[PDB]
RNA sequence: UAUGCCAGCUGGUGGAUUGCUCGGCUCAGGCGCUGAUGAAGGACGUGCCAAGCUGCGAUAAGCUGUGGGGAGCCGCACGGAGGCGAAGAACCACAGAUUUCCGAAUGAGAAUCUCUAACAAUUGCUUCGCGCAAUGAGGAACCCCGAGAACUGAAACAUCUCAGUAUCGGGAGGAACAGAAAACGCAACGUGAUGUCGUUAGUAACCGCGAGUGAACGCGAUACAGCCCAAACCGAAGCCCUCACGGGCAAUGUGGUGUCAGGGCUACCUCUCAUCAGCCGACCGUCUUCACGAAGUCUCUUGGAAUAGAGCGUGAUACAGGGUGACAACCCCGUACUGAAGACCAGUACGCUGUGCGGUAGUGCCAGAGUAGCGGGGGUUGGAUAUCCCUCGCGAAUAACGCAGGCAUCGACUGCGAAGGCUAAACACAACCUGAGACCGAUAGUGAACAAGUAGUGUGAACGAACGCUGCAAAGUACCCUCAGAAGGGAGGCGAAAUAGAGCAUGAAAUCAGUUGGCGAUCGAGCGACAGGGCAUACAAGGUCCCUUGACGAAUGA
RNA sequence: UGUAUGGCAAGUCUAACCGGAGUAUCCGGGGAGGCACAGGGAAACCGACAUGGCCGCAGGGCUUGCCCGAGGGCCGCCGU
């Protein structure tokens, strides 16, 4: 198919062929698998102290004093799992493999599929993104890679009727639960992904909910945050080109 | 760091000289324009206007600045004890704005004016 | 919902009498214990059998059936075409760490083939010649005698 | 519980055909795809060549693989083909997706099931 | 209707629950030795008032200098009194001063004190004098060398296994150890020091051939690096102390040469860019610290308070995280960007100086002995005839020789030179610094968020808890009455709230006081389920229900 | 050792590790090696049906009981 290229003003400026990958049948099950793996693979090993609750010579008096056969020291029960201060029977363990494998072919296929889900206005709208447009992904001239001010990228996006999505992501959520105590107090919607060719858009990255990536390594999470396909994206003339051989 | 426990910790255990940044208040529009800074370390001489508490709207002279507790005493911003004595109601520089600076110290004025250092 | 997830409340978690899941006695001994007594069933019989020749005196032949060669003669467009002619050595994978390449005679041969290998089976020749072909034996293959 | 959304649709389409049109193979193929993947068909060319006949569509209730040779000019319809299979077939005949077969022949006529 | 049963209400007791996190747990990166110049640890001191902790040491919460920092300060610790700071204090970084007693503890003795100059003891050098030096002890584990179980598994048990594990003795370093082939043996016209990682492989091998045990060569990677003696031939040409003088060492050999690309010697060819010694000496990177650093504190409403709702506006190479009287990019610290410093990399790389590599022919000049190897007895290993080691006995050759290639002997072939020595880098741990988290969230998580190895127990080795939360601000309750009264009570005052009033957020159950409804001093015990009656009931979140008659009307049926 | 789902298929998967980067994620590279592609025999050593026949389910065809009949079942035949 064909994709309309836009200049830094929001006016059409030609158009190239939308590479074949964007015709890869959307495969949410595969995309979800790839994202679940990426998320699990960055999780850190953890586990309680191997010796917690065991640092004691507590013994059971056995029968005779009308007490349960529970190990005790200085009159207090210890060590056993049913005892306060006792060991944790089956605790989290460092040794556990918290990683997930994924065949390269299966992962690459999901990348292509997530890419394809990008060129579908309906999917993108379903995923939740707010925008007034028909053609998608939003393709732009390589001069985008030279912008420097975030404000500039704003105007361009407003000129593309795609800034509404950033308005959507301009609201952090204060999560329910103790994540808060571990530094995970806030969370916010995912907005526009900006794929360029040379380097990530320093100018757009701070946009609320935005994520910046490069065609050579843009991944499944990038294209389908949370495993949900159809992210409102904006490629770069050259970006669109590179992506094709992924 | 990014972890809340460490953030609050470093702020509560910061050595005395680092406590200075904890008693900084925003500068009035004129003062901002005049010295090229958005805020300054409130001093016992400066004049300030209360922008937030139950005393919002009132102005007065900074009578005391405690680095330990990171709080300031502003003239007439008080509380009436039971016996009748009028004691000061501590304020966080964050809810305050500097409208006039005490510049008797050569050093403060110098820093306050250099474009490469902030006071 | 998995089986494990439905055990809370069952008390015995599927082990039957709570007097069951205790120690190794419930398994008739640790590991293969009693493989010659109470649990002899399904264990291979005890005893020694045969001998082994030292590892470095053993030869490993790289083999391939005519069927594989023949089925891909056309596809092997990167190999000699005569009045075809192929050097098995270049076809068989794992032909480096192999002591020698041998052609086996499984399947049919629907082409005139001139095969060169270190060794052939009776049926490999019979089939290759019967299809109007020849079998060339490598210099290495010159160990037949 | 199939996971592939595409396989799900295919199966629903194979049914709709078996019910609407007269196709009985379609409902037959649907019932096999619904069964465990391990029971699905994995057929190599050598087997198609042996039992297929021209003007009779070969229907594989599974996937076609590339081992062996195919000379007959037949239209093979499967859930999927290995890249090699699809290539060798189109050289002497035609490789087609069940989704297409269901459309060109909803009555499922003149077809031979091969596994 | 007493004693009393059940449920509730008001108040309590209790401290669950919810919310909160100054602590833990785990992972990751960096970094890493201290001590006779007396460490680490401990004792006792030290403050205006000082019990604990921390700091410090008779100069005692400190003294000096330089740099930073800044108008405040006098640790935790918010009192009273007083003091210090523009003579630039506090505070931070580096450097220096001081630094009691015991402690390896070293003049001698001793439960931290005492008695009459002291490296005690063992060593090396030696002016043979403690004159110059060394050792000792500590450290989270890691590392190396020795000693070395048992429960257990084998459904008993002895070999085997647990296991060369636990534990013990000795000792090094920031890493250890290993290491330039008497190798390998995909047997080759091949590989080429050593660790380590992935694999080879649960393969080969062991084994009451039971249970079990269990490599290597090679390969793919990481990192790479290669050298010095002994002897031959020279023969004092040498080395150490000292400013010097002078002394000491050294023919039982200091020093030159040389080290399998064998060397030496004799005769030549050519040349050095090898090697070895020494000088100089980083970039980048990484880790930590620091400077600078954009934009609202505008309107209305609510509120005790606006980081809320509604409205208007702004920055963003910065929408990480935290603070602030409630949900904050723009109020404060930070954060992006840029820049600086220190540490590690590293006295390494690069560069340089000096030396001089190599080749031909001749020469039986040299080339590490209780060794190689054999036997007896054991241990150990996968090592089987074929692992590695100990012990007792025996015991060779000399490169024209010797060892190895998984049984022995002889020959061939291939590899390689033992019985002297050194060696960067890649790897282990986690004391220390910093970072991180689908970890826990105060009976959890460390034993320890608190006085935590604290209180406390034991003669001792050793053992060992519990205790987090007022409020936005102390505004931490003046005055009056009562009382034996700084008690408590009453009244009163503060605050949005005192049922937030001091172990003070919330405040469950068990349970207690008072009290409401029902029952109740002639009556029977799994305490109820289902039916049906009495009596009792503010609202809300349920709104149905009763009787006449009529319609419909299964089985059944006068 | 099964099973369900999913990728690829006569193949399939990388391990350590290397480069990139948005720097534990992630993108690219890495096939060493493993399993599968032939078995039988202690070993030496030797080395197989891309289908020859018959039943016949599903499914298809036909002029509506008659054909073709994958899979499956019964034999043949082949390697050791
Ligand atoms: Cl064998
Ligand atoms: Cl097949
Ligand atoms: Cl080799
Ligand atoms: Mg515990
Ligand atoms: Mg919760
Ligand atoms: Mg300034
Ligand atoms: Mg002494
Ligand atoms: Mg036993
Ligand atoms: Mg080691
Ligand atoms: Mg036995
Ligand atoms: Mg063992
Ligand atoms: Mg070996
Ligand atoms: Mg020398
Ligand atoms: Mg043993
Ligand atoms: Mg605890
Ligand atoms: Mg005792
Ligand atoms: Mg309370
Ligand atoms: Mg290979
Ligand atoms: Na303990
Ligand atoms: Na009891
Ligand atoms: Na793990
Ligand atoms: Na069971
Ligand atoms: Na049980
Ligand atoms: Na057993
Ligand atoms: Na038996
Ligand atoms: Na090889
Ligand atoms: Na360190
Ligand atoms: Na004290
Ligand atoms: Na000191
Ligand atoms: Na000494
Ligand atoms: Na002496
Ligand atoms: Na037993
Ligand atoms: Na026994
Ligand atoms: Na044994
Ligand atoms: Na504020
Ligand atoms: Na011996
Ligand atoms: Na050898
Ligand atoms: Na607690
Ligand atoms: Na391979």
């Amino acid at each position: 198919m064909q994709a309309t290229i836009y200049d830094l003003d929001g006016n059409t400026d030609g158009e190239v062929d939308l590479p074949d990958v964007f015709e890869t049948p959307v495969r949410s099950d595969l995309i979800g698998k790839a994202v679940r793996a990426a998320q699990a693979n960055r999780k850190q090993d953890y586990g309680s102290d191997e010796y917690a609750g065991l640092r004691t010579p507590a013994e059971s008096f056995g029968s005779g004093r009308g007490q349960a056969h529970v190990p005790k020291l200085d009159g207090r029960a210890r060590r056993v799992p049913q005892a306060v201060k006792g060991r944790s029977a089956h605790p989290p363990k460092t040794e556990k493999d918290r990683s997930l494998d994924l065949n390269d072919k299966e992962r690459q296929l999901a990348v292509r599929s997530a890419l394809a889900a990008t060129a579908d206005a309906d999917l993108v709208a379903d995923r939740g993104h707010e925008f007034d447009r028909d053609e998608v992904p939003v393709v732009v001239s390589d001069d985008f890679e030279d912008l420097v001010k975030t404000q500039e990228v704003v105007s361009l996006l407003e000129a593309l009727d795609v800034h509404a999505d950033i308005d959507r992501a301009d609201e952090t959520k204060i999560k329910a639960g103790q994540g808060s105590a571990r530094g995970r107090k806030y969370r916010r919607p995912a907005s526009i992904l900006f794929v360029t060719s040379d380097e990530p858009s320093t100018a757009a990255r701070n946009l609320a909910g935005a994520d910046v990536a490069t065609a050579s390594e843009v991944n499944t999470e990038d294209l389908a945050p949370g495993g949900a396909p159809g992210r409102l994206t904006v490629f770069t003339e050259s970006a669109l080109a590179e992506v094709a051989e992924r | 760091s990014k972890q809340p426990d460490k953030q609050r910790k470093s702020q509560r255990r910061a050595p005395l000289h680092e406590r200075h940044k904890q008693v900084r208040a925003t500068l009035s529009a004129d003062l901002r324009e005049e010295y090229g800074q958005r805020n300054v370390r409130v001093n016992a001489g400066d004049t300030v206007e209360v922008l937030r508490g139950d005393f919002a709207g009132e102005e007065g002279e900074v009578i005391n600045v405690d680095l330990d507790k990171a709080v300031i005493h502003v003239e007439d911003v008080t509380l009436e004890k039971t016996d009748g004595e009028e004691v000061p109601r501590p304020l966080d520089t964050s809810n305050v704005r500097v409208t006039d600076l005490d510049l008797e110290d050569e050093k403060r004025e110098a820093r306050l004016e250099s474009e490469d250092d902030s006071a | 919902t998995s089986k494990k997830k439905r055990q809370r409340g069952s008390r015995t978690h599927g082990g039957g009498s709570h007097k069951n899941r205790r120690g190794a006695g419930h398994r008739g001994g640790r590991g293969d214990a009693g493989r010659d007594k109470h649990e002899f069933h399904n264990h291979e019989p005890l005893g020694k059998s045969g001998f082994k020749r030292p590892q470095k005196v053993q030869e490993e032949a790289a083999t391939i059936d005519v069927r594989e060669i023949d089925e891909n003669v056309t596809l092997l467009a990167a190999d000699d075409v005569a009045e075809f002619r192929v050097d098995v050595r270049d076809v068989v994978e794992e032909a480096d760490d192999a002591d020698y390449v041998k052609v086996l005679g499984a399947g049919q041969v629907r082409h005139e083939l001139t095969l060169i290998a270190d060794d052939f089976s009776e049926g490999a020749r019979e089939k290759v010649e019967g299809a109007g072909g020849s079998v060339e034996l490598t210099d290495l293959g010159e160990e037949r005698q | 519980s199939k996971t592939n959304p595409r396989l799900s649709s295919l199966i629903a389409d194979l049914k709709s055909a078996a019910r609407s049109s007269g196709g009985a193979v379609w409902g037959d193929v649907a019932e096999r795809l619904e069964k465990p993947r391990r029971t699905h068909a994995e057929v190599n060319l050598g087997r198609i060549e042996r039992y297929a006949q021209e003007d009779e569509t070969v229907v594989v209730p599974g996937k076609v693989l590339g081992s062996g040779v195919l000379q007959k000019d037949v239209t093979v319809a499967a859930v999927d083909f290995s890249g090699t299979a699809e290539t060798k077939i189109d050289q002497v005949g035609e490789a087609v997706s069940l989704e297409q077969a269901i459309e060109n022949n909803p009555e499922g006529s003149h077809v031979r099931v091969i596994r």
Side-chain angles (χ1 to χ4, degrees), chain B residues 5-114:
Chain B
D5 274 26
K6 289 201 174 192
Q7 280 294 306
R8 304 187 204 73
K9 177 161 175 169
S10 61
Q11 281 167 35
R12 273 190 288 124
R13 306 185 195 183
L16 265 185
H17 77 291
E18 273 174 46
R19 294 254 143 191
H20 288 301
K21 44 197 173 185
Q22 288 195 55
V23 281
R24 304 178 57 73
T26 211
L27 289 170
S28 65
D30 291 313
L31 292 173
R32 285 183 184 168
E33 175 70 57
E34 173 166 28
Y35 300 97
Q37 292 185 183
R38 174 165 286 303
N39 35 253
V40 71
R41 173 191 180 303
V42 179
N43 275 258
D46 313 341
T47 292
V48 157
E49 57 172 42
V50 184
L51 295 185
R52 280 301 189 283
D54 281 346
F55 299 73
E58 289 186 58
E59 277 198 60
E61 165 174 41
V62 179
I63 311 302
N64 177 61
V65 175
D66 185 299
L67 284 178
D68 188 316
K69 293 181 176 179
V71 180
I72 68 183
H73 283 40
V74 170
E75 187 129 55
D76 294 316
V77 178
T78 65
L79 287 176
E80 180 161 51
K81 300 202 67 172
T82 325
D83 58 33
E85 171 178 51
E86 213 145 289
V87 300
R89 146 71 217 221
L91 298 174
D92 187 295
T93 64
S94 167
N95 299 313
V96 125
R97 166 194 272 147
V98 178
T99 62
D100 190 294
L101 305 162
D102 188 312
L103 304 178
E104 299 186 304
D105 176 15
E106 306 166 59
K107 300 189 171 179
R108 190 187 182 192
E109 182 175 56
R111 275 184 277 108
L112 220 184
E113 274 176 39
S114 68

Side-chain angles (χ1 to χ4, degrees), chain C residues 65-131:
Chain C
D65 283 312
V66 292
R67 165 178 48 63
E68 192 193 313
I69 300 174
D70 197 75
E71 290 185 310
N72 308 298
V73 287
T74 63
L75 321 184
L76 285 171
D79 288 293
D80 291 52
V81 181
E83 61 177 61
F84 304 68
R85 180 217 191 66
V86 63
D87 196 340
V88 192
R89 287 174 291 183
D90 304 292
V91 183
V92 183
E93 301 179 297
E94 327 135 51
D96 315 304
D97 42 300
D99 197 293
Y100 68 74
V101 177
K102 177 174 189 164
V103 169
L104 295 181
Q108 301 149 43
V109 197
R110 313 167 175 178
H111 303 287
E112 329 165 64
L113 293 169
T114 298
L115 306 168
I116 299 182
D118 306 303
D119 184 43
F120 302 74
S121 61
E122 217 182 69
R125 281 165 185 165
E126 286 190 52
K127 292 190 182 180
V128 174
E129 306 185 322

Side-chain angles (χ1 to χ4, degrees), chain A residues 20 90 96 134 142 188 191 216 219-220 227:
Chain A
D20 297 324
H90 293 299
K96 176 177 189 178
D134 307 300
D142 300 327
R188 91 194 312 137
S191 74
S216 68
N219 58 39
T220 311

Side-chain angles (χ1 to χ4, degrees), chain C residues 35-70:
Chain C
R35 49 85 78 250
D36 59 310
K37 275 273 177 173
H38 48 293
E39 309 193 325
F40 76 86
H41 317 278
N42 301 146
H43 269 100
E44 293 196 65
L46 307 170
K48 298 179 193 178
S49 184
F51 74 98
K52 301 181 190 175
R53 291 181 73 226
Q55 297 184 297
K56 59 176 169 180
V57 185
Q58 295 176 47
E59 287 171 41
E60 180 182 61
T63 66
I64 182 170
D65 283 312
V66 292
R67 165 178 48 63
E68 192 193 313
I69 300 174
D70 197 75

